[PDB]
Design a protein around this ligand. Structure first.
Ligand code: FT0
Ligand code: FT0
Lengths: 115, 115, 115, 115
């Protein structure tokens, strides 16, 4: 599990459950191609998106559908989604955790990169 | 100024100066078209991006070139850029201020919508 | 104004208005003594807290009454208040801006030190 | 383990290791009395501070010594420490995770509260 996504809700102080997540990888032709997708679990975590074999050097985009999330809680949020864009696996393979903390008009994202 | 961008640097505790900012508007074929751009001023702000006449309802993307900012300071950054995607919507006469606070492996962004 | 405070609301995407702010200076017996206070303005800002003559080097604490702010909006908050503790130090002629971005279970704060 | 503390470094994108943490509990006489203390582990987490028997209703202060942390990395940071102040265990016992994300001039803190 070289790529993991974790989402917290800053209004409720709890994991953000059932948040859709789509990952894309920048193609040879500069296009965003579909790489992996998942929903967060009761702990707000999404494991198993990829494998170290699949997850090669590349520019990746992790899209967290925060608008759907807030709307289901009756909140009409500012952002369409949270987008995280980064180069992965230059120094060789690493483990990436992409965290986001969500509020209706604000979010933050941090990466924790290992080995 | 219906739309303003403000960037701060969390490592140095200062406005983030000379950061390039590109704004796009989503067009009918779901493609991003270039709408407005500039670089932040000594105060970390970018004013004069658009006019009320131009700024119509629609989905906009604001892209903050964080990677180049960190590179020109010698600091190894994680993200390619910071992205903010939102729907501008009447109701109204709102000023949108898109603010962002930058660290090498983390950013936050918030929208302040007034008047 | 050598010291300014600025608060934003991440749930509503607006300045945080009428938030009480207390500033203290640490005295010789390691006790906090009341230095300056006020409430944020319609723009979420609090100016005029001190003067350059008064603001000498020392350890200061800035306490933002977040709990009362959330309660007057009906939202159940986690923190009693947000606290910022720092050493003011010459080098210099700096303006200190203490900014804070508020959610019910989360806050961030940043210092912007200029001139 | 009803109280856990987790600290991330936003400059390095890694857990913040060996960060001292002190917890206080507000006494009957309005004084902050010493409750528990610990250092974060290689994962940036601090477990075992207290027990559900010990950890009664109260107002608590979690002090994270961020200045020592940054100074050991050669950074002279803005803040003396991060202070998190909250009422614990009104609805009966809960599980509290206090997270902080650190930068030299900025930090954020979020609580995740369970059961
Ligand atoms: O403290 C956390 C934090 C505080 C404020 C921020 O944005 C602004 C900074 C200064 C003025 C207005 C907004 C922000 O992005 C993060
Ligand atoms: O303090 C602000 C803050 C703290 C933690 C965060 O991510 C995590 C939350 C809990 C555990 C681990 C990481 C975060 O995104 C913001």
């Amino acid at each position: 599990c070289p790529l993991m996504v974790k989402v917290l809700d800053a209004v409720r102080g709890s994991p953000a459950i059932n948040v859709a997540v789509h990952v894309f990888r920048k193609a040879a032709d500069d296009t965003w191609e579909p790489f992996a997708s998942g929903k967060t679990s009761e702990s707000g975590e999404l494991h198993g998106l990829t494998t170290e074999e699949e997850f090669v050097e590349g520019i990746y985009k992790v899209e967290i559908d925060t608008k759907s999330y807030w709307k289901a809680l009756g909140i009409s949020p500012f952002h369409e989604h949270a987008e995280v864009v980064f180069t992965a696996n230059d120094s060789g393979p690493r483990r990436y955790t992409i965290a986001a903390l969500l509020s209706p008009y604000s979010y933050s994202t941090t990466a924790v990169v290992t080995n």
